[model samples]
Target chain A: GVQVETISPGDGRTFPKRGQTCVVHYTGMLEDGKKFDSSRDRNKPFKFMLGKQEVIRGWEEGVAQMSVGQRAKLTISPDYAYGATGHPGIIPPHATLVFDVELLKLE
Target chain B: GVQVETISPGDGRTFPKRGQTCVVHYTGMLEDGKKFDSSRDRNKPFKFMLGKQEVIRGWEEGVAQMSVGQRAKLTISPDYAYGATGHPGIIPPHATLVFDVELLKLE
Candidate 1:
């Protein structure tokens, strides 16, 4: 197995610049490698537009860096992430994040 | 197939007393008996809190009337459903809905 290189930041996929909707696969892990969110468990790809407010800043920035089939790990700062309001029971406020994201396609 | 009865309305399942969130399978049809939505397409059931606003009012009211294993059809009025701004492309506003809902089980 090949080791992943330097980690990437966020995908900058924005709404206005985005083409069509897409299905994505992603996994969010703690810096310590604890997974907290994943699209795989849903047994379905998560679909969203490029720059629609459907995702948080971290995701938008991170996913933009991917080409089809490319996988990248992202480390996001809270300032460029879920600022204060977090998922009621899941994510906490101002938490740093690490996500392994895969861009499937533009559909 | 046996003749079905006049469809019922929405599920009235509320939040607080609702047991663990459940797994539900449903098929939505038009009053004209045309199929619209189905959990089968997603290959998974939609999960939500009974009163969490995750689903429209029709589903809440209709599911409330069901016991485990009960199958019922609901003809919903828009006021009690996905109001003016409906699902962007799929559902239209003020549209009457018919769902053949099955109450599977509470988790």
Candidate 2:
């Protein structure tokens, strides 16, 4: 179970757990606020299961801190990020990621 | 330079080289001609360098066989493809690929 404390309508909280799928809408920006990715841009929701070790460590930890309908502004350091190789052209090596994330549903 | 002997206007041929970048519009279909991926779906072109060793072996070798504005039907085995890991969820493991590729401008 997760808690809900709101700043705005549909605002959520964090309670990430293993073996459950999470639906999310997020926007990512560089330090200067230049956007690089958004779930809205894809016109689709992003879904991933928690603690599967399938994604980067930061993403795993970050999602765990959120609950449904909660919005978070997360600033992640590279050590918890997409390490050395990166995702080739899409993500650079040792880059920090700032995401505005909305926890949609946990199932 | 690549040669162009057309099957249609703007149709092209192949002359694979190193270092330069290329813009292409391509379509991929399964054995049943089931469309899997296309530049039209993304509403954008794809760019990659020839002989850079940055792309997959199949992509590097396949692009070498194509010329500007050329349309090619390529069937690639998994050995020349995304291997075991694949691109996470987007592509499946050990899957063969069939592509209808169009070469665009080189840069």
Candidate 3:
């Protein structure tokens, strides 16, 4: 199982509902501090539909709990992340993924 | 020629330089306020390289003047907008254009 912790409580209002759009800034890394991906480096917020399985299970669950302007870290177990098959060289099998994510907008 | 004005001045500290990447939310229309395009409708902020001519002349010049979190409106003349040829039926020839833009991030 993974843990979801809030870094910033964020402003109330504008929580994304299922099938609504959620925009976020995220840095994906391993527990050891090895980086895998970052939307911040690209200076663009990642946008996706919430609770639609448009992303991994961890993200869907984690982001659904966020409100606009919230910052949270999601510690995702392999089953909630890339799963047993893993994501090729980016993430290994049974790996634990850590993501520092900021919810920028909910539409 | 195009006239640029800030609608909401954002939190200062990050301003994009030439060759940098800018992420923005934009709604484009004609002078009559008839909508032509919108990143908001797509629920995605538009991303592009500043001053790279990756977009219209009005956008290249207009967005360069913005700082992160700033919102601006650009009134673009035909020459600086779609110009004489225009963009097929999406924009008529010599049509003036207007864009409401918000600079969300800079990298």
Candidate 4:
């Protein structure tokens, strides 16, 4: 199951459309609270084309519901996250993931 | 003339040193305020090696003075900016440049 909670709502009336680009800041962790990565710590946002599968499947779906300036927490099932293969050492096999994400812009 | 005004100062004790990498968010333009480029619009910061001449001369010098989380407005002379050759079509020959820049991280 995928659980989402909006921490901060956006002011924009428009959401990102498919094929458009979204810039986001995110902190990713395993269910056990082991941190994997954080764009905020790097002092930059991650930029990717929407619906392009450039990221994990969970990110594709979770970010679709957000508007610019919105922030959300996402709890993603392993099926929707890393799947059976996982991401090697960075993520264990079939591990569920949690994320705090902010939608910064659509380009 | 290279004039710099810090809009927001950083809390970090260290500045980016030569050979280190820097990440920044910025809006670059001519003196007339015609925007040439903006990292904010792209939802990412521009990254480059300090003192590497990977970017304009103005950027190398201006960004060197910034610490993490600092933001500054820079007014750059032709000699320190695009120079006489400029960037074809994007910047006029010998044009002065202005930028609003935020230092995001040093790597």
Candidate 5:
């Protein structure tokens, strides 16, 4: 599992489940803190269904542990991320990743 | 794994790959041919990101094998479906699933 360090707490009793749609804002980086991708761009946050592979193993696990309005920094090891088959032209192989993400909505 | 039986073949030099969103029309059924759910409401159809868990294991595997404009019947085993949980009221335990799915779009 990835490491989840909470930056801010969330509200009570609401959590995301599989098959439900969700929206979030995220910024991805390398272990060295080089920013790679930011969902905050293009005036569009991101949307993904929970438990789906739309993201990554590390992200799924990390986000599932969070609730609405929560913010956290997820530190993902290569195994839980892109592995050796890194995203070409973007991510390098065996790269540890960092992402500051916030759960914005669940529906 | 899923058992894919083509109902109709599709023409393509391109096929869907992971990390992309796709749309489809599907009708789910039980082993006894009982209808469960459908994406063809002439309404919104359905959309999901490939390799993501927006659907189910057997479903994702089945759709991944298809190309745009193709239609197929997927016979999914219990292990690849709802498993022991049985999906509460919709599906029964260890039930075999069948889906008549059409690959409408990939983008």
Candidate 6:
């Protein structure tokens, strides 16, 4: 399971749906708030299709709950993240990850 | 203008349509045959929406004519390729590119 906390509620006009393209910016951290990864650092918002399992399970669940222009904090458990075998060279094994995510566009 | 020559025509089962997802493996070289890029080396085929301009104009036009399991050669002119402002550190200015591309899947 993952935790989603709203940092900024977005415009209530439209929200993302399955199969729609999403543009999101994110910074991930460890339990100790140690920075690990960031789309903002690359200046390229990550783009992917919703419900496509193109991302971690927690991310699929987390970002799906966000509206366009929303910013939120997602606390992702290891099971829904890297799990037992974490991302090599970047994420440690069984590490809980947290992310500050912003949904920029939905199409 | 770009030129397309078939290396191996695929089975005449079906062809791709615009807006469909395509998986391709490609090796790009300069007019002198100096290798510039290859999706095969990464062991991951490039996946994109056809006709969506996710790739260069040359690729859009060339890959659009391909069927699943087909292999072709694309000689791309500067305009359809990188143009006058070529990709820095990878391609030279006003470069003409050559490619051997395999279309693996369409959906």
Per-candidate iRMS values, in order, are: 15.0, 13.1, 15.4, 14.7, 18.1, 15.3
What is the lDDT, from 0 to 100, of the residue A18 in candidate 3?
87
Q: Please write out the lDDT profile of model 3 over residues A1-107, one tens digit for every residue.
A: 67878899887676789889888999877887655456675466788998777899888888887788999999988899877788532356888999999998877
Q: DockQ numbers for every candidate?
A: 0.03, 0.04, 0.02, 0.07, 0.01, 0.02
lDDT of 6 by residue, A1-107 (tens): 89989899887667788899989998777887546445563346889998988888998988888889999999999999989999533466888998999999887
Worst 10 contiguous positions by lDDT, candidate 1 chain B = B1-10
lDDT score, candidate 2, position A47 = 84
For model 1, what is the C-alpha lDDT against the true structure? 0.60
On TM-score, the stronger of 1 and 5 is 5
lDDT of 4 by residue, A10-79 (tens): 8557788989999999987777665655668556678999877787778888888888899999999999
Candidate 6 chain A least-lDDT 10 residues: A34-43
lDDT of each: 0.60, 0.63, 0.79, 0.80, 0.79, 0.80
What lDDT score goes with residue A87 in model 1? 42
State each model's TM-score restricted to chain B.
Answer: 0.74, 0.75, 0.92, 0.91, 0.92, 0.93
TM-score, prediction 1: 0.44
lDDT of model number 4? 0.80
Candidate 3 residue pairs in backbone clash: none
Chain A superposition TM-score per model = 0.75, 0.80, 0.93, 0.93, 0.94, 0.94
Q: Report how far residue B86 has shifted in candidate 4, in Å.
A: 2.1
Q: What shift in Å separates residue B48 of candidate 4 from its native position after superposition? A: 0.2
- Indicate the DockQ of the complex predicted as candidate 4: 0.07
Steric clashes per prediction: 23, 13, 0, 0, 3, 0
Pairs clashing in candidate 6? none
Judging by lDDT, tell me the better candidate of 3 and 4: 4
lDDT of 3 by residue, B45-89 (tens): 788987765888888877776778777778889999777888877
Error of 4 at A89 (Å): 45
